Design an enzyme around this catalytic site. Structure first.
Site, mmCIF file in Angstrom:
data_model
loop_
_atom_site.group_PDB
_atom_site.id
_atom_site.type_symbol
_atom_site.label_atom_id
_atom_site.label_comp_id
_atom_site.label_asym_id
_atom_site.label_seq_id
_atom_site.Cartn_x
_atom_site.Cartn_y
_atom_site.Cartn_z
ATOM 1 N N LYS A 121 -4.945 -9.884 -6.504
ATOM 2 C CA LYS A 121 -5.869 -9.469 -6.076
ATOM 3 C C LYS A 121 -5.948 -8.039 -6.156
ATOM 4 O O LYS A 121 -6.133 -7.389 -6.963
ATOM 5 C CB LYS A 121 -4.748 -8.326 -5.117
ATOM 6 C CG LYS A 121 -5.380 -7.716 -3.788
ATOM 7 C CD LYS A 121 -4.209 -7.181 -2.636
ATOM 8 C CE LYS A 121 -5.039 -6.603 -1.706
ATOM 9 N NZ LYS A 121 -3.490 -5.889 -0.326
ATOM 10 N N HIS A 161 -3.676 -3.231 7.592
ATOM 11 C CA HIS A 161 -4.521 -3.319 6.822
ATOM 12 C C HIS A 161 -5.100 -2.151 5.835
ATOM 13 O O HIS A 161 -5.508 -0.842 6.383
ATOM 14 C CB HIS A 161 -5.580 -3.982 7.433
ATOM 15 C CG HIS A 161 -7.301 -4.035 6.884
ATOM 16 N ND1 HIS A 161 -7.302 -5.237 5.880
ATOM 17 C CD2 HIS A 161 -8.256 -3.950 6.811
ATOM 18 C CE1 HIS A 161 -8.342 -4.851 5.257
ATOM 19 N NE2 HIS A 161 -9.242 -4.126 6.061
ATOM 20 N N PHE A 162 -5.833 -2.091 5.155
ATOM 21 C CA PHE A 162 -6.698 -0.926 4.388
ATOM 22 C C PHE A 162 -7.270 -1.537 4.155
ATOM 23 O O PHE A 162 -7.998 -2.116 3.267
ATOM 24 C CB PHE A 162 -5.852 -0.852 2.525
ATOM 25 C CG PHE A 162 -6.335 0.994 2.255
ATOM 26 C CD1 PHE A 162 -7.265 0.724 1.596
ATOM 27 C CD2 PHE A 162 -5.511 1.826 2.474
ATOM 28 C CE1 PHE A 162 -7.499 1.966 1.331
ATOM 29 C CE2 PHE A 162 -5.939 3.508 1.892
ATOM 30 C CZ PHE A 162 -6.835 3.213 1.530
ATOM 31 N N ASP A 163 -8.976 -1.059 4.322
ATOM 32 C CA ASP A 163 -10.008 -0.923 5.146
ATOM 33 C C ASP A 163 -11.156 -0.092 3.810
ATOM 34 O O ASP A 163 -11.707 -0.748 3.497
ATOM 35 C CB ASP A 163 -10.916 -0.416 6.562
ATOM 36 C CG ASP A 163 -11.553 -1.963 6.702
ATOM 37 O OD1 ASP A 163 -11.495 -3.306 6.387
ATOM 38 O OD2 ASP A 163 -12.327 -1.388 6.722
ATOM 39 N N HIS A 195 1.026 -1.385 0.103
ATOM 40 C CA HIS A 195 -0.229 0.116 -0.099
ATOM 41 C C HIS A 195 0.697 1.065 0.031
ATOM 42 O O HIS A 195 0.292 2.018 -0.387
ATOM 43 C CB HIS A 195 -0.458 -0.136 1.408
ATOM 44 C CG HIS A 195 -1.343 -1.002 1.542
ATOM 45 N ND1 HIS A 195 -2.750 -1.505 1.074
ATOM 46 C CD2 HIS A 195 -2.257 -2.479 1.728
ATOM 47 C CE1 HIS A 195 -3.606 -1.933 0.600
ATOM 48 N NE2 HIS A 195 -3.465 -2.549 0.964
HETATM 49 O O1 LIG Z 1 -10.007 0.060 -1.172
HETATM 50 C C1 LIG Z 1 -9.614 -0.857 -0.963
HETATM 51 C C2 LIG Z 1 -10.614 -2.054 -0.818
HETATM 52 C C3 LIG Z 1 -9.754 -3.111 -0.350
HETATM 53 N N1 LIG Z 1 -8.298 -3.178 -0.602
HETATM 54 C C4 LIG Z 1 -7.632 -4.900 -0.104
HETATM 55 O O2 LIG Z 1 -6.601 -4.216 0.731
HETATM 56 C C5 LIG Z 1 -6.017 -5.309 1.483
HETATM 57 C C6 LIG Z 1 -5.161 -4.738 3.032
HETATM 58 O O3 LIG Z 1 -4.123 -5.804 3.186
HETATM 59 P P1 LIG Z 1 -4.395 -7.357 3.626
HETATM 60 O O4 LIG Z 1 -3.350 -7.159 4.466
HETATM 61 O O5 LIG Z 1 -5.392 -7.080 4.394
HETATM 62 O O6 LIG Z 1 -4.267 -8.332 2.421
HETATM 63 P P2 LIG Z 1 -5.297 -9.014 1.687
HETATM 64 O O7 LIG Z 1 -5.118 -8.713 0.410
HETATM 65 O O8 LIG Z 1 -4.389 -10.532 1.421
HETATM 66 O O9 LIG Z 1 -7.562 -9.328 2.239
HETATM 67 P P3 LIG Z 1 -7.311 -9.815 3.309
HETATM 68 O O10 LIG Z 1 -6.884 -11.128 4.085
HETATM 69 O O11 LIG Z 1 -7.997 -8.555 3.865
HETATM 70 O O12 LIG Z 1 -8.914 -9.917 3.388
HETATM 71 P P4 LIG Z 1 -10.144 -9.207 1.895
HETATM 72 O O13 LIG Z 1 -10.702 -7.880 2.696
HETATM 73 O O14 LIG Z 1 -11.936 -10.220 2.161
HETATM 74 O O15 LIG Z 1 -9.837 -9.156 0.579
HETATM 75 P P5 LIG Z 1 -8.995 -11.227 -0.555
HETATM 76 O O16 LIG Z 1 -8.142 -10.249 -1.161
HETATM 77 O O17 LIG Z 1 -9.021 -12.394 -0.424
HETATM 78 O O18 LIG Z 1 -10.758 -11.278 -1.508
HETATM 79 P P6 LIG Z 1 -11.993 -10.174 -2.110
HETATM 80 O O19 LIG Z 1 -12.270 -9.324 -2.728
HETATM 81 O O20 LIG Z 1 -12.714 -11.168 -0.627
HETATM 82 O O21 LIG Z 1 -12.989 -12.013 -2.837
HETATM 83 P P7 LIG Z 1 -14.434 -13.179 -3.496
HETATM 84 O O22 LIG Z 1 -15.412 -12.643 -3.702
HETATM 85 O O23 LIG Z 1 -13.791 -13.609 -2.166
HETATM 86 O O24 LIG Z 1 -14.142 -13.775 -4.412
HETATM 87 C C7 LIG Z 1 -7.064 -6.059 0.689
HETATM 88 O O25 LIG Z 1 -8.100 -6.027 2.928
HETATM 89 C C8 LIG Z 1 -8.765 -5.376 0.464
HETATM 90 O O26 LIG Z 1 -9.155 -4.779 1.857
HETATM 91 C C9 LIG Z 1 -7.949 -2.006 -0.643
HETATM 92 O O27 LIG Z 1 -6.417 -1.671 -0.634
HETATM 93 N N2 LIG Z 1 -8.200 -0.868 -0.510
#
Ligand SMILES: O=c1ccn([C@H]2O[C@@H](COP(=O)(O)OP(=O)(O)OP(=O)(O)OP(=O)(O)OP(=O)(O)OP(=O)(O)OP(=O)(O)O)[C@@H](O)[C@H]2O)c(=O)[nH]1
Length: 124
Positions: free
Chosen positions: A41, A119-121, A12
Site C-alpha cells: 500500500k 475511507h481515509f482521503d 487506519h
Molecule cells: O494521506 C493519505 C492518502 C491516502 N491514503 C490511502 O488510504 C486508503 C483509504 O482506505 P480504502 O478503504 O479506500 O483502501 P485502498 O487502499 O484499497 O484504496 P482505494 O480503493 O480507495 O483507492 P486509491 O486511493 O486509488 O489507492 P491505491 O492504493 O489503489 O493505489 P495508487 O496510489 O492509486 O497507485 P498507482 O499510481 O495507480 O499505482 C487509500 O484509499 C488511500 O487513499 C491514506 O491513508 N492517507
C-alpha cells in the site's frame, strides 16, 4: 466477511497518544495490519485518537472527496496521526516505509447506517 467500517479500523485506527513501536513504526504497522500482503500500500495514515472521536468526524465539516464524491468530512480539530509513505527502494514483497508524524485535520469518507468512516482521503 469484513465490512468497510471494520476495514477502516484495521487500516487506519491506532488509538494511542501518538506512534509507539519497537522499530520503524510504519514498517511494523503496515505489515501487522496486513497492508503489505497483496501489494505495498503506497500511502497509509494511522490516527491516534479514540474511535469515538474519529467516528464523530462524519458529522463535522463536509468536503468534496478527491474522487468527486461528496460524502467526505474534515475534522474541526487537529488530530494526532502518522503518515506511512512507501520508499523509493521499496519493491513488493519487500515493502519499506518512511514514517512521518503529524498533527493535522483528517478527511474521511463516511457511508452506511450507522454513518461511519470507511475511507481515509487526505489530511490538511
Ligand atoms: O494521506 C493519505 C492518502 C491516502 N491514503 C490511502 O488510504 C486508503 C483509504 O482506505 P480504502 O478503504 O479506500 O483502501 P485502498 O487502499 O484499497 O484504496 P482505494 O480503493 O480507495 O483507492 P486509491 O486511493 O486509488 O489507492 P491505491 O492504493 O489503489 O493505489 P495508487 O496510489 O492509486 O497507485 P498507482 O499510481 O495507480 O499505482 C487509500 O484509499 C488511500 O487513499 C491514506 O491513508 N492517507
Amino acid at each position: 466477511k469484513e465490512t468497510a467500517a471494520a476495514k477502516f479500523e484495521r487500516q487506519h485506527m491506532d488509538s494511542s497518544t501518538s506512534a509507539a513501536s519497537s522499530s520503524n513504526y510504519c514498517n511494523q504497522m503496515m505489515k501487522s495490519r496486513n497492508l503489505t500482503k497483496d501489494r505495498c500500500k503506497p500511502v497509509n495514515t494511522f490516527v491516534h485518537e479514540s474511535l469515538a472521536d474519529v467516528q464523530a468526524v462524519c458529522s463535522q465539516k463536509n468536503v468534496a472527496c478527491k474522487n468527486g464524491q461528496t460524502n467526505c468530512y474534515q475534522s474541526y480539530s487537529t488530530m494526532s496521526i502518522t503518515d506511512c509513505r512507501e520508499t523509493g527502494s521499496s519493491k513488493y514483497p519487500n515493502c519499506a516505509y518512511k514514517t512521518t508524524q503529524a498533527n493535522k485535520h483528517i478527511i474521511v469518507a463516511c457511508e452506511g447506517n450507522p454513518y461511519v468512516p470507511v475511507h481515509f482521503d487526505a489530511s490538511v
